[PDB]
């Protein structure tokens, strides 16, 4: 269900006269290791002439967040290949972990741009180590000291089809 980060490695099927071919590594986010290896092969095909038949997965491992509980801002490189040619994009997200930030980024992309997961690419992800490195205001508003906001429209659920109490919105 939830996205799972993974790392992939390969060496393009070593052959005669080329001992120990250089290793390559690429962090990947996918629901399963199979999709992660598929995206890794799709990236290697673009950045190199090699092909999945020409190589193999030297290793595959999940990358758990070092501090999942800790809140962290997360900028992310983004590019979507629609409707026109691909172009760079950037977005800030306040998420407790990089995987949840990638999930919220995929949701915001599918919403505000109708981009499909096949088109979206995550060139980079990195935490904002220090305050005021944030740029866009929508993250800055949450950084205010002693911030507090209400939820005036607390629409309580009612399992019963009927309600004699005439429920209020309180709050």
């Amino acid at each position: 269900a939830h996205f799972k980060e993974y790392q992939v490695i390969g060496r393009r099927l070593p052959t005669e006269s080329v001992p120990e071919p250089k290793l390559f590594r690429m962090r990947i986010f996918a629901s399963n290791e199979v999709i992660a290896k598929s995206r890794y092969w799709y990236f290697l095909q673009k950045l190199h002439k090699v092909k999945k038949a020409s190589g193999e997965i030297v290793s595959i491992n999940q990358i758990n967040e070092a501090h999942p509980t800790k809140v962290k801002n997360f900028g992310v490189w983004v590019r979507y290949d629609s409707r026109s040619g691909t172009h760079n994009m950037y977005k800030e997200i306040r998420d407790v972990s990089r995987v949840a930030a990638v999930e919220t980024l995929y949701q915001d992309m599918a919403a505000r741009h109708r981009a499909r997961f096949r088109s979206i690419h995550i060139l980079k992800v990195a935490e904002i180590e220090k305050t005021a490195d944030v740029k866009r205001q929508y993250v800055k508003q949450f950084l205010t000291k002693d911030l507090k906001f209400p939820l005036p429209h607390r629409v309580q659920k009612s399992t019963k089809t009927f309600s004699y109490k005439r429920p209020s919105t309180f709050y």
């Binding site: 900028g75 950037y90 980079k124 990195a126 904002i128 490195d133 740029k135 866009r136």
Partner: peptide, 10 residues
């Protein structure tokens, strides 16, 4: 507006 543009250059 990327916070770490300088890091990618190196």
């Amino acid at each position: 507006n990327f916070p770490y543009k300088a890091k990618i250059l190196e």
